[PDB]
C-alpha cells in the first residue's frame, strides 16, 4: 500500500486557546526533544514506502510523530495538554510495538522518552 496521509494538524472547527501548559509543551518540551541527536527519525511520519517497510501501517494504525505534534501545537489543535502528551506517548509506544527490542530505533526512542518524562514533570501550573 501507499503511505497514509499524515495526521490532521489544523481543524478550523475546533475551538482555540492558549494556556501556560500548551505554550510550555511547544517552547520547552517539543523544542528540546526536536534538537536531540536522536530526534531525526521522529521528526516526520514514517515513510514506509521509501523505507521498504510494507507492514508498518498494517501494524501501526495510530501513527504519530513530532513534526505532526509541532504543527498541532502551532495550529491550536489541542485544547488540553493531555491531548498533546497522549500524542507523544503514542509515538513512543508505536516504536515499541513495531520494532524488535534492542534495535537502535528503540534505544533512540527510550532516550527521547526519558527526556520527555523529565520535561513533563516540570509542567507549569494549570489556570
Ligand X SMILES: CCc1c(C(=O)Nc2cc(S(=O)(=O)N(CC)CC)c(C)cc2O)[nH]c(C)c1C(C)=O
Q: Which residues bind ligand X (CB under 6 A)?
A: 41-42, 46-47, 50-51, 53, 56, 95, 98-99, 105
Residues 64 and 90: beta-carbon distance below 8 Å? yes
Alpha carbon distance 57, 32 (integer Å): 28
Residues 63 and 80: beta-carbon distance below 8 Å? no
Nearer to ligand X, 8 or 47 (CB): 47
Task: State the nearest-atom distance from the C-beta of 104 to ligand X, in Å.
Answer: 8
Spatial neighbors of 86 by CB under 8 A, at least 6 apart, are none
Task: State the nearest-atom distance from the C-beta of 100 to ligand X, in Å.
Answer: 10
Residue nearest ligand X by beta-carbon distance? 41
Residue 76 grid cell? 491550536
Show the CA angle centred on residue 57, arms to residues 55 and 60, nearest 5°: 105
Nearer to ligand X, 24 or 92 (CB): 92
Task: State the nearest-atom distance from the C-beta of 72 to ligand X, in Å.
Answer: 17
Nearer to ligand X, 24 or 42 (CB): 42
| CA–centroid distance for 32 within its chain | 13
Nearer to ligand X, 60 or 81 (CB): 60
Task: State the nearest-atom distance from the C-beta of 106 to ligand X, in Å.
Answer: 8
Amino acid at each position: 500500500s501507499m503511505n497514509p496521509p499524515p495526521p490532521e494538524t489544523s481543524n478550523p472547527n475546533k475551538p482555540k486557546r492558549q494556556t501556560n501548559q500548551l505554550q510550555y509543551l511547544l517552547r520547552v518540551v517539543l523544542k528540546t526533544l526536536w534538537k536531540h541527536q536522536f530526534a531525526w527519525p521522529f521528526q516526520q511520519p514514517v515513510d514506509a514506502v521509501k523505507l521498504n517497510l510494507p507492514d508498518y501501517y498494517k501494524i501501526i494504525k495510530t501513527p504519530m510523530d513530532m513534526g505532526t505534534i509541532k504543527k498541532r501545537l502551532e495550529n491550536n489543535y489541542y485544547w488540553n495538554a493531555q491531548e498533546c502528551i497522549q500524542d507523544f506517548n503514542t509515538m513512543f509506544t508505536n516504536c515499541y510495538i513495531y520494532n524488535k527490542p534492542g534495535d537502535d530505533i528503540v534505544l533512540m526512542a527510550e532516550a527521547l522518552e526519558k527526556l520527555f518524562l523529565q520535561k513533563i514533570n516540570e509542567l507549569p501550573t494549570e489556570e
